[PDB]
Amino acid sequence: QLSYHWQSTRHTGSVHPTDPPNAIGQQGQNIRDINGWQWGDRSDPMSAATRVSNFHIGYSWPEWRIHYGSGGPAINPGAPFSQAPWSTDPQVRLTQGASEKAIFDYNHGDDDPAHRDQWWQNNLPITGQTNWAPKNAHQANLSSNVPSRQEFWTQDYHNTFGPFTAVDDVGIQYPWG
Amino acid sequence: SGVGHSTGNYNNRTEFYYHGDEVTIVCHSSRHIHLNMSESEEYKIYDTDRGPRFPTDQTLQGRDTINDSYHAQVETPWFLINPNSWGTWMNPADFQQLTTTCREVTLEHLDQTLDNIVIKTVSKQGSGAEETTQYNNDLTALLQVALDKSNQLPWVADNMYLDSLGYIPWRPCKLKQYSYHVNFWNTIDIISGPQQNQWQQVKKEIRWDDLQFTPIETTTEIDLLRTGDSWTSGPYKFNTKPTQLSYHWQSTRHTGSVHPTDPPNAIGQQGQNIRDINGWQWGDRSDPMSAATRVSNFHIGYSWPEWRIHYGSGGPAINPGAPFSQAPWSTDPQVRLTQGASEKAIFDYNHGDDDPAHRDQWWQNNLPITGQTNWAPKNAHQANLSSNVPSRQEFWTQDYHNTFGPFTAVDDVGIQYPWGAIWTKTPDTTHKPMMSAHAPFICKDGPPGQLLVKLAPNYTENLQTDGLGNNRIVTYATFWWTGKLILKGKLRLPRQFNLYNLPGRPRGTEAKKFLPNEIGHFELPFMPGRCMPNYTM
Amino acid sequence: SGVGHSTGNYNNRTEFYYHGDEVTIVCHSSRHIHLNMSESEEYKIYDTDRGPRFPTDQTLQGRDTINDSYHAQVETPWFLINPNSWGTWMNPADFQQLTTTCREVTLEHLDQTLDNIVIKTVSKQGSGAEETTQYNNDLTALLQVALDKSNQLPWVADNMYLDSLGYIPWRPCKLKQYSYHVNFWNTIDIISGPQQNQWQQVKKEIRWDDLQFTPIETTTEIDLLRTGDSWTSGPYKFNTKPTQLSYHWQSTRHTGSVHPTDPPNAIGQQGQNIRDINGWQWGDRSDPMSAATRVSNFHIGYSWPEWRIHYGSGGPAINPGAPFSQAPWSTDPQVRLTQGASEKAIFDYNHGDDDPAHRDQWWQNNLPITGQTNWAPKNAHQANLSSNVPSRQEFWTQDYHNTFGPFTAVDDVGIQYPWGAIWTKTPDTTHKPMMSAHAPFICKDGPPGQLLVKLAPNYTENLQTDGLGNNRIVTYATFWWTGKLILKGKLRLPRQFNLYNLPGRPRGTEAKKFLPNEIGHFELPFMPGRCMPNYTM
Amino acid sequence: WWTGKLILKGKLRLPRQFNLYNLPGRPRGTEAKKFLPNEIGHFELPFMPGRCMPNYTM
Amino acid sequence: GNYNNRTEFYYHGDEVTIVCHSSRHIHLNMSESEEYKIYDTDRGPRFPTDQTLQGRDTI
Ligand SMILES: CC(=O)N[C@H]1[C@H]([C@H](O)[C@H](O)CO)O[C@@](O)(C(=O)O)C[C@@H]1O
Ligand SMILES: CC(=O)N[C@H]1[C@H]([C@H](O)[C@H](O)CO)O[C@@](O)(C(=O)O)C[C@@H]1O
Ligand SMILES: CC(=O)N[C@H]1[C@H]([C@H](O)[C@H](O)CO)O[C@@](O)(C(=O)O)C[C@@H]1O
């Protein structure tokens, strides 16, 4: 594929019912009492986050997994995605989208002989499969009630690849790939 | 047809044809549609608020950020006609017939028409006291019809908000405006602050530099129809796979060779597991030859960080685990165990609730599907599997790992009769999903084209650029949608000696609930779609 | 079609077809047109006032007489449907596609239709307080359509006032009345009085003895259409030349043989022009062998008394010099250098401004076109060209002469995407113009015929000769224009090793400006039409 | 001298939207001179993404 | 043989054909030995000699 995909699960399918804004500064207003399919036993808060979907875009992963096989440690790669939605400070470099780095030289497209050049490929356009493991959570039940402090977990680092998952590969990386 | 000739008739019959092992189900559906004038003639792009219940503070430590509805969309003057839901095509007795006589079913063909277009304008004479309303036919007014057959438009016809045509043939249907998401970022950090117990917004905005805007008029050709005019979609052919009409009760402990047992000798006695036997066992385990450590070829079901919350770009979303019944763990019926990837349909009068002005709801917990039951917190793992029992360390519980793997066999949810979607579009990504979390049929090529309709604007004599709905005669339309959906099943024949439990209404329900009352209100029953036991192996 | 059958459909798609070196672009456009009743049924001849800002005195010494709008015209009850503008035929992504994949493009074919005619009358009941307005279909009323295929009518469809059909497919369009100039004299002397610093009118009047009056009814046949009726133009075939989709950066100093140079030896060093060389030089100049005095075969660009004001019969008019970029002379971005024959489009909501009630404007300065840059005040001429530098006398600056001549090579402006005209009529004179100052295509034979429409008068029961609009039932119409414009391009393939700058929005603009906002307002971007560098020689 | 011939088969890309695309070009923070020969003939090749343009997933 | 580094594009309908010609001038020295050799290596730069980083640098 020569295209990048911006759609996450929240970008796909039916849009949450909204009444339009009436003027230039106004935002749409999510409708409160609506019908639909929701996950678990959840009807009171009809919300886009708990809307059922057919598939799921992207998966989480123990990012920068180090395998340590026979023959030594090796990176077990997670899926490629952009960290641009989480970035904020451009000084700190978030490497976790399975980004790659090409180190190259004069014959491979560096300008200066005797010094190697390098390009960090962070995959900035690929969003919507963005899946930073530490930012996820899981809860015991999904209902009209908010779970307590226990019953809610963060920073798990599980692999969420499964039979419902749709995910893109990195694609062509032109000079060095 | 001119003005005084009908352009079509009404067929809501379902027809069954049995030949050999093959059954052909022809579903005719006809609906009378009420269409108003579009609230504006403009395409609009805007984002929204968070929606009800999203936190304003850290009282719940961001656990309630799962309530986020934030999104950005491109409003479109067009209305969507979506027949993607069982109930729009089959009444309860028809679907009962389907799930009684068929072991599996596939989609084969879809045809659609629109006809008998009536467009009226409303006139209001007199002042408030003697205000009189006149409804006049506008014989030259136009209805606009766009069918996107090439699937060039964003696909939003998944029925997840139950936008589908209504389920009961004698009531009128209304339509929802077509809208789709644009590119936005909705990143929320739930581990922000010291102690990592605070939620903070990271990026919430529309991505204009990247945004995609695809109006109907420049993407598809549009048919213009007057009152004597009719419209047909032409044939659509499904390319999909059959869905199973059975539920599977077999776990890994129910499958394959049975542990050697000597029979009981009398009525109250139980079988006695044989002690010294041969066989294959996992690890280096021979002394305790036991069914639990018997080797198997495959594994039924997988565990999962159940009710996984993803928090992607665009906000949190449930990453669904596999469907299964919590009935084996239930005990107390008061507590509701939601963890089998259960779903809940919230619906209304046109979608099968009895009372107008109040919505009804059905919690689909998938009680028959056991044996892929895999509640994460109940599992364990141990360092070694041997004749020795591992110590306290070397044994772990309550892990919440994903156990999906190359040896895994697992069922999808199957048809959910009244409210469930029928088909779904395949996402265009490098790795296509292996199975669907809700819709039983995945269209390998494009799904049926989205049928979009809009009443052409009927202007007053003074057309001002500053005006919106002022220079627009108040106009509405009624017309008739008809459709034909062909299904192909395989016949179901008895595989057992004893009696089956045949499909019927849900357990705790009485027939009167699904029958018209004094004023004509009734509900449609949930029907499982995997209604009967079958062997997995 | 009778009364309840549509006479046409809606296609706004643009289609691209690539075969070998040839590209075929099929532009479908459909517009919903709102037409009122003509303000009078009479042809009128009248002249005007001077217009805003024309001097009443000698405060500015007549320099502000350039503000003259005076003219005489023959008002005509007819309305013009003019599709002569990019934007009426192509959306921004389509035109981006065109200018990315095509090195040049020609016009090939034009087809037009009118259909789905709706004619309504307005009734007003009750006194002011309870005044109620009724809109009734008049099923027997007539629309008049005249296409002048023989070009017997004065051609006024040049889009210079932006009278063209609107650019965004989902909005309605209104039409301007057809009118054309009659013979008048508007001579203003700007060197009048002692000191020759005073402006005085010489002749300002209509030339009745010579005047030409050509009404529609006696010049062309007229089609009469009721609501069930449709109209087609038939095929029109363009005879024109291709327009270049590239901009040229090469001046005479950029072309041909390079001055002999020895290379730099290291990163900070510059080449060193060789001193003693052979070659051809202008005049008797050999000692200073220099690139400036190198002989060439041709000369790129010409100078001109820039912003020439003609003051003909009928008043002052700009005599345009060649288009070029002032970017090489710019420096301060605050001061705006207008002298490259730059143009300015002033436009409104239907023509691609976002805000109703306020007009927007784009100054087209032609920044990529350099190398024909020829600012008159910066040139010079010298008596002789030799090894000797001429004295103070023998050297002249700031001349403002016209340097167009037989050795001159010069580009026209090219396509100006949103607002620019497409074609133009060739003036019928002994010497045909060599090139066009604005419209990219010059029709060698007649241009597409002017499409004129007028709603037939709907009279009351009492027809009085003294009456005008009293004996005329208030009547308006809506109908649908469709058109098909076929373009033939030549494919653009990379001529260089390095990356091109591909067509996109203008420099200082953000994508949101060209995307619908909350209420649906947006602008269309200017696209240059010469978007990419190419070699001249 | 090595010579080679590699044949690729693509599918054409046509506009799926009304508005303007961002067309492939050099990376964001880079200037064209970096990818052009200098006085002594040294230059770099630009990274090009290979997924360069938005498309709908569903 | 001759030298062709041209890339050629051919557009027909929905199909594009891209023909990439590449030519390279190759410099080849004599092999440093004529023998096949089997050997293992050292750890490489930055691999820990001690437990200062608790083995995090064993990557
Ligand atoms: C080809 C090239 O010049 N690469 C430059 C990269 C890229 O700009 C980024 O890696 C892109 O993500 O930046 C560096 O400083 C770096 O971070 O290693 C090295 C170098 O200056
Ligand atoms: C269609 C219908 O009437 N649904 C009823 C459901 C179902 O009995 C269960 O959800 C099945 O699991 O029960 C409810 O009380 C509920 O829990 O939301 C609502 C409603 O009374
Ligand atoms: C379409 C549009 O928005 N046009 C803008 C122009 C252009 O940026 C320049 O004219 C380009 O040369 O700038 C103005 O301020 C101006 O100078 O008249 C008006 C307006 O803001």
Coordinates of N, CA and C and ligand atoms in Angstrom, one line a residue, chain C residues 336 344 347 360-363 365 419 513 523, ligand 3:
Chain C
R336 N 4.3 46.4 -2.4 CA 3.8 45.5 -3.3 C 4.1 46.0 -4.7
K344 N -5.7 41.0 -10.2 CA -6.4 40.7 -8.9 C -7.8 40.3 -9.1
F347 N -13.8 38.4 -5.4 CA -14.8 37.3 -5.6 C -15.7 37.3 -4.3
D360 N -14.0 38.5 -1.0 CA -12.6 38.2 -0.8 C -11.8 38.6 -2.1
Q361 N -10.5 38.6 -2.0 CA -9.7 39.1 -3.1 C -8.3 38.3 -3.1
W362 N -7.8 37.9 -4.3 CA -6.5 37.3 -4.4 C -5.7 38.1 -5.4
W363 N -4.5 38.6 -5.0 CA -3.6 39.3 -5.9 C -2.7 38.3 -6.6
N365 N 0.3 37.7 -8.5 CA 1.6 38.4 -8.9 C 2.5 37.6 -9.8
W419 N -10.6 31.5 -10.5 CA -11.4 32.6 -11.0 C -11.2 32.9 -12.5
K513 N -8.3 26.9 5.9 CA -9.0 28.0 5.1 C -9.7 27.4 3.9
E523 N -13.1 28.6 1.4 CA -12.6 29.2 0.2 C -12.0 28.2 -0.7
Ligands
LIG3 C1 -8.1 34.4 -1.3 C2 -7.5 35.3 -0.2 O1 -7.8 35.0 1.0 N1 -6.8 36.3 -0.6 C3 -6.1 37.1 0.3 C4 -5.0 37.9 -0.4 C5 -3.9 37.0 -0.9 O2 -3.2 36.4 0.2 C6 -2.8 37.8 -1.7 O3 -3.5 38.7 -2.5 C7 -2.0 36.8 -2.7 O4 -1.1 37.6 -3.4 O5 -4.4 38.9 0.5 C8 -5.3 39.9 0.7 O6 -5.1 40.4 2.0 C9 -5.0 41.0 -0.3 O7 -3.8 41.4 -0.4 O8 -5.8 41.5 -1.0 C10 -6.8 39.5 0.6 C11 -6.9 38.1 1.1 O9 -6.6 38.0 2.5

